[PDB]
Amino acid sequence: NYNGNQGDDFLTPSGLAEPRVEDFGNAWKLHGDCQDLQKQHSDPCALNPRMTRFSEEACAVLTSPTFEACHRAVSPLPYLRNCRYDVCSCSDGRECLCGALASYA
Amino acid sequence: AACAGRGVRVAWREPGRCELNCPKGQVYLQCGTPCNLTCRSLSYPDEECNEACLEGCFCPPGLYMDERGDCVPKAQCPCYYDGEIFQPEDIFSDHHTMCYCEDGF
Ligand SMILES: *[C@@H]1O[C@H](CO)[C@@H](O)[C@H](O)[C@H]1NC(C)=O
Numbered sequence: 183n184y185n186g187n188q189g190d191d192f193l194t195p196s197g198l199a200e201p202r203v204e205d206f207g208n209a210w211k212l213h214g215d216c217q218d219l220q221k222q223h224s225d226p227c228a229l230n231p232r233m234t235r236f237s238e239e240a241c242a243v244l245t246s247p248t249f250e251a252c253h254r255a256v257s258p259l260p261y262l263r264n265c266r267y268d269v270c271s272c273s274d275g276r277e278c279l280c281g282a283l284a285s286y287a
Numbered sequence: 288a289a290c291a292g293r294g295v296r297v298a299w300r301e302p303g304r305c306e307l308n309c310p311k312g313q314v315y316l317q318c319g320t321p322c323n324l325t326c327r328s329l330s331y332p333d334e335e336c337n338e339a340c341l342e343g344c345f346c347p348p349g350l351y352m353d354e355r356g357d358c359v360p361k362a363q364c365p366c367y368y369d370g371e372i373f374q375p376e377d378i379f380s381d382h383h384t385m386c387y388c389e390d391g392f
Pocket residue numbers: 320323347348349350351
């Protein structure tokens with residue numbers, strides 16, 4: 183609702199804020215035959231364990247000294263979570279790495 | 288062009304007059320086949336094409352013309368679906384479908 187507050191952004195058309203991001207997002211789906219998302223599986227590296235070592239080692243650049251000038255201008259932590267998710271679960275983790283780093287930059 | 292409209296083909300261009308110097312990596316042909324020049328021809332191969340061999344700039348025999356008009360191998364062509372453009376090895380799935388881009392299709 184662009185009101186300066188995070189605490190009500192999970193508002194829904196029923197006028198209540200869902201504490202679950204899944205039920206929040208489901209309440210904004212435009213079509214009735216779309217499946218309701220039951221649970222959002224954070225940290226998808228469990229489904230491809232081969233990817234986790236690279237996902238960590240590569241996305242840790244966001245918290246490395248190269249971004250240190252930015253770390254006090256924008257907090258890197260959401261971008262690091264997004265990066266590790268992206269690299270662990272996408273069609274090409276190199277492109278997803280570059281997209282996450284570009285997103286923080 | 289009137290000659291070609293009567294089936295007579297003339298090699299009339301010379302370095303002294305009116306060389307059809309080609310864009311990008313393309314090469315001149317006095318007569319080349321239009322039906323298989325573009326990556327769209329890979330993306331819509333079931334569509335019939337019968338247009339005559341004609342003068343112009345064409346990709347070398349193993350390469351297809353991309354959106355920006357340079358010539359790429361068949362594997363590097365993007366794919367066209369519902370009027371949207373997908374890069375090689377792109378995947379998508381939806382409640383009705385699951386599709387991927389390879390060899391321009
Ligand atoms: C287009 O078709 C001709 C045969 O009609 C073939 O010689 C040529 O290699 C084809 N072009 C490509 C890029 O495959």
